[PDB]
Amino acid sequence: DARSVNGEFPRHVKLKNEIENLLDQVTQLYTKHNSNYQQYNAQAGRLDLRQKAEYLKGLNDWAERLLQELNGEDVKKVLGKVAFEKDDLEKEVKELKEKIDKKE
Amino acid sequence: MDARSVNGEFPRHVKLKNEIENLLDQVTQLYTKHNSNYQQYNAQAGRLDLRQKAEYLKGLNDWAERLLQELNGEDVKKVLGKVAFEKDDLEKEVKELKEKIDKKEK
Amino acid sequence: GPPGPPGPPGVPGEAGPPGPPGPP
């Protein structure tokens, strides 16, 4: 009760832990993204335009995939697909109720 | 589709660095505010009883978690759960109404 | 030349004002 402040001290530590770990993940992403650009600059010399674009695209694709996992944009994209499927099934019910109750 | 832009991939690199920097900035600010909040609590705690301590620290935790879940998309995962559940019941409703629409052709 | 993306979010606001005085 008193030592844990009714559970709110361990809750504080949980949140500090979660924030620390996310800060660590985002920092590492940031450093790897910048080091990826140096690798690109080093390679660019031997690559034609189509190959430069293909390599830089995969480096960007890598950063963005991780970033969208960290910032929850991956989950917002999922939410969108599911919300659309929900709002299409609602459009189906409205139609089928019209077709069944009237006209049949 | 240019040579100077690497077919759009160089400005895309800079965009992603910007997006990563801005998230790092938001999480850093959250981290510092969360730790400064605990000091404010420690300063006040002297004059508060256990129930009053818990009420104050709870609101400070509530604040941090609400922001964290907006940054890490856990707020949206909770919404996705409610919507997915609502979708699996609406699918059971359409199956019935499609059957009743089928049988009502008779 | 289309416009650039919006800038990053602002910093969170300061902590709220003290609550009202307690009872006598």
Next chain:
Amino acid sequence: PPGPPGPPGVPGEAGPPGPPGPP
């Protein structure tokens, strides 16, 4: 080509009042 990103936003509003003080 697209312009650079805009400047940072304005700081948020102050938080809500705290609870009533003790007796």
Next chain:
Amino acid sequence: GPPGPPGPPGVPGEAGPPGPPGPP
């Protein structure tokens, strides 16, 4: 073609944390 203008300012920050319980 020249670069486009800078994008608009970012979104305001979230509200700060609750204030302290305030005076006895």
